[model samples]
Target: AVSSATINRARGLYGDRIAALKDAVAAGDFKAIAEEKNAFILFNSGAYPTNKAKKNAAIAQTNEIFKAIRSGDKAAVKSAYDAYMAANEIRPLPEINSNVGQGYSSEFDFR
Candidate 1:
C-alpha cells in the first residue's frame, strides 16, 4: 500500500485531468478525448494482477464515456465521467500507527 498523502495528491491530479477531458468531450473532439484516455491508461500502468482491476475499470469507464460522446449525449458523458473519477479515487494506503515509536527513546540533534 502507499501513503494516503500520495493517493490524495493523485486524486487531485486526476481530478484536474478529468475536468479537461470533459471540456474536450463537450467540444466534440473525439480524437483528443481518445488520446487523453490512452494517456491515462498508460499513466496508471503497474505490476501484474494487482493493478488489473483498476486498469480494467478505467478502460471500461472510458469506453462508456466515449460511447456517450459519440452519440452526442452530453449528460450521459458527464455522468459517466463522474463515475470514472469516483472509481479512480479508490486506492488502498497504509494506516498510521500511533504506537510506532512507543518503545523507542531517541534524542536527535539537528544542525
Candidate 2:
C-alpha cells in the first residue's frame, strides 16, 4: 500500500503514469498494473539513441536469422552475434558515433 502523499509526489515526478499505476494497484487491477509497470519500465529505460541503434541491431539480427534459415548455416548466427555485440557494445563507437544510419549492412550480415 502506498501513502497518498507518496503517490501524489510520485505522480508529480512521473506524471499521471505513477498515479494511474497506484490507483490500478489499489483497485486490484493486476493486468492494468502490469501494463502500467511495463510502460514505466520502458519509459524510464529509453535513451534518445536507443531506438535507432536497437532497431538497426534488430534488423542485423533478423538478417542473420534469415540467412541461417535460408542457407542452413550455423556460422551466420555466430557472426551475427559478433557483429551485434561489436556494434551494440556497452558504449557506441567513436565515443559519439550512433547507429542511426547503419541500416543493417548485409556486408556484415552474418557471413
Candidate 3:
C-alpha cells in the first residue's frame, strides 16, 4: 500500500482523505473512517457546475453509501469505495493538476 505522505504529495480531497482515514484507522475508529469517505461521496461531483439534474442524481447515489455506513455495511463500503475511486479516477485527478487547486475543479468546491 502507498504511504499517506506519498499520497498527500499528489494531494487532492481524496488524497487528504486517505490520510484522514488512516488516522482513524490508527485510532481504530471505523465509524470515523466511513464518515471521512462519506463526505467525499457527498461532494465530489458538481465540481464544475454540471447539469443540475445530473449532479443531483449523482449526489443521490450517496444514499447507499450513507445507508451502508449507518447500517454497518462494511461490504457495501468496500464495493462502492472501489467504484468511486476508479470511476472518479480518485488517485490521479490531484496529481494531474498539481496546481493551487487539488484537481481541475477542486478550488471551486473550496470557495
Candidate 4:
C-alpha cells in the first residue's frame, strides 16, 4: 500500500484532471478530452499486479469516456468518468512505478 501522504498528493493532482475532464465533457469538445487523456496513460508496471490492473482499467475507462463523448452520450461519458475516478483512486494520475509522473503523450483527432 502506498503512504497516505502519497495518496493524498495523488488525489490532489487527480482533482485537477477530473475538473478538466468535466469541463471538456460539458463543452462537447473532443479536442479538450483528447488533450486531457494523455495524462492518464500508464507506461511502466507498478510494484504489484493490482496496480497494473487498476491502471489498465482506468485507461480502458478513458477509452470509453472518449467514445461516449464523441457519440454525444453524456450519460455514458459521465458513467465512464465515474469508473475512471474509481480506478484513479486505487492508483493515481500518470500511473507508473516511478515516483515522478511520466508517460507518452499522444494526440487524438476525434473530429
Backbone collisions counted per model:
0, 0, 0, 0
The TM-score measured for candidate 1 stands at 0.52
Question: Across residues 9-67, which tens digit of lDDT does each residue of candidate 1 receive?
Answer: 55545545555564455456667766676445543542112467877777788788888
* Model 3, span 6-74: residue lDDT tens: 334443654457434433333345677656754464345423244467446545544555665566656
lDDT of 2 by residue, 1-111 (tens): 335555444434433443334323333444553454433333223311235666555455535634543554445534543453345332222312223236756444222
Compared with the true structure, all predictions reach lDDT values of 0.58, 0.40, 0.48, 0.55
Which parts of model 3 have CA positions greater than 4 angstroms off?
1-11, 18-29, 34-38, 92-111
Q: TM-score of each candidate?
A: 0.52, 0.29, 0.46, 0.53
Assess candidate 1 and give its lDDT: 0.58
In model 2, the Cα lDDT at residue 94 comes to: 38
Model 2: colliding residue pairs: none
Report RMSD for candidate 1.
Answer: 14.8
Predicted candidate 3, C-alpha RMSD: 13.6
Q: Is candidate 1 or 4 superior in lDDT?
A: 1
Inter-residue clash pairs, candidate 3: none
